[PDB]
């Protein structure tokens, strides 16, 4: 039978594949590049656009936009290119023949769902579509029906408590501190060591540093005093051109911003204290279960030691008797895709799809009404 597509519009990556697969058939940065310099060689090739791995390969020549910022799609004209490239080039599939499943952060502007639908039915003519809360899919991904899911992307962090398959919407918290703001802070502090990263292509050079060499302090003040006391922390890295750059305590100072957004100059508290203040909003009956089923999700939670730092910290807020457990499967970056793959292949779900017929009768308001 025709299988549904499963597609996740992260800020940093697009993940796509066929429902029932255990991994995405395409991942690539959701990045759109345009050439800026003059084209010298007549008879060379010419393109108004590159997408994904193309815009990565040539990035020295390009300005790189992300069409998504803090999980809001900030211009549609590029996004439609990213979807077009995903279906036609990466999956090599006609969208006319497959249901599609699309994925979204919990609070983001309600107009986003309307436009995101209108492009699926008008542009790609998809038979059937659905839009699913990232934290919900993380539960399907991690084999659970009760938990509190902390999920942090390239563009958004959020908590969503779920009990017995009921979501609990009063208890839902959203800090937009994410991968990109860890990058921009990493650039600002790297300036202290006498390096500057100035451009879009160069910012991804920063990001590769962040991914390779950042880690989370199990005590911040201990390691901060340690690096001043001796350089054993210090590690060094090769830029694309072969220049070495060398980084000390400063590589942990970015992961610590998730636990002290005072560094970035946010009002709100670290994601431990949001996680706790979310659980406190929940009914006192359930909380013993939410304390055990803490689930990490999304790539910004891949930093080594974030699990233990979370456990050691929230085990200080929570009352001493409660069992606190933190559950960090090593695939968690994928897990929102995996759980969407599982959800899209359930038979009970097949009644849930928004049909092309019903959209055509009802108009895009249908997406709020039916979908949740």
């Amino acid at each position: 039978e025709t299988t549904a597509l499963v597609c996740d519009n992260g800020s940093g990556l697009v993940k796509a594949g066929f429902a029932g697969d255990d991994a995405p058939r395409a991942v690539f940065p959701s990045i759109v590049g345009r050439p800026r310099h003059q084209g010298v060689m007549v008879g060379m090739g010419q393109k108004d656009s590159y997408v994904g791995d193309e815009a990565q390969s040539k990035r020295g020549i390009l300005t790189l936009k992300y069409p998504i910022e803090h999980g809001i799609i900030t211009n549609w004209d590029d996004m439609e290119k990213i979807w077009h490239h995903t279906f036609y080039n990466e999956l090599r599939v006609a969208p006319e023949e497959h249901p599609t499943l699309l994925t979204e952060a919990p609070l983001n502007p309600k107009a986003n769902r309307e436009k995101m639908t209108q492009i699926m039915f008008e542009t790609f003519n998809v038979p059937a579509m659905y839009v699913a809360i990232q934290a919900v899919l993380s539960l399907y991904a991690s084999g659970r029906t009760t938990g509190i899911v902390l999920d942090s992307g390239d563009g958004v962090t959020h908590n969503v408590p779920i009990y017995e398959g009921y979501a609990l919407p009063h208890a839902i918290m959203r800090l937009d501190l994410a991968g990109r703001d860890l990058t921009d802070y990493l650039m600002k502090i790297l300036t202290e060591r006498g390096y500057s990263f100035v451009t879009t292509a160069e910012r991804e050079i920063v990001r590769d540093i962040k991914e390779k060499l950042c880690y989370v302090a199990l005590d911040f003040e201990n390691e901060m005093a340690t690096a001043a006391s001796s350089s054993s922390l210090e590690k060094s890295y090769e830029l694309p051109d072969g220049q070495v750059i060398t980084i000390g305590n400063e590589r942990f100072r970015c992961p610590e911003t998730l636990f002290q957004p005072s560094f970035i100059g946010m009002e709100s508290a670290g994601i431990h204290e949001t996680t706790y203040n979310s659980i406190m909003k929940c009914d006192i009956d359930i909380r013993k279960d939410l304390y055990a089923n803490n689930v990490m999700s999304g790539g910004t939670t891949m930093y080594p030691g974030i699990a233990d730092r979370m456990q050691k910290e929230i085990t200080a807020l929570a009352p001493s008797t409660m069992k606190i457990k933190i559950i960090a499967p090593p695939e968690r970056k994928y897990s929102v895709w995996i759980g969407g793959s599982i959800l899209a292949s359930l038979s009970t779900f097949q009644q849930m799809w928004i049909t092309k017929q019903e959209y055509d009768e009802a108009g895009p308001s249908i997406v709020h009404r039916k979908c949740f």
Binding site: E69, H70, G71, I72, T74, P109, D176
Partner: peptide
């Protein structure tokens, strides 16, 4: 966004 943030 439209207000409290750049998107």
């Amino acid at each position: 966004w439209x207000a409290x943030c750049p998107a």
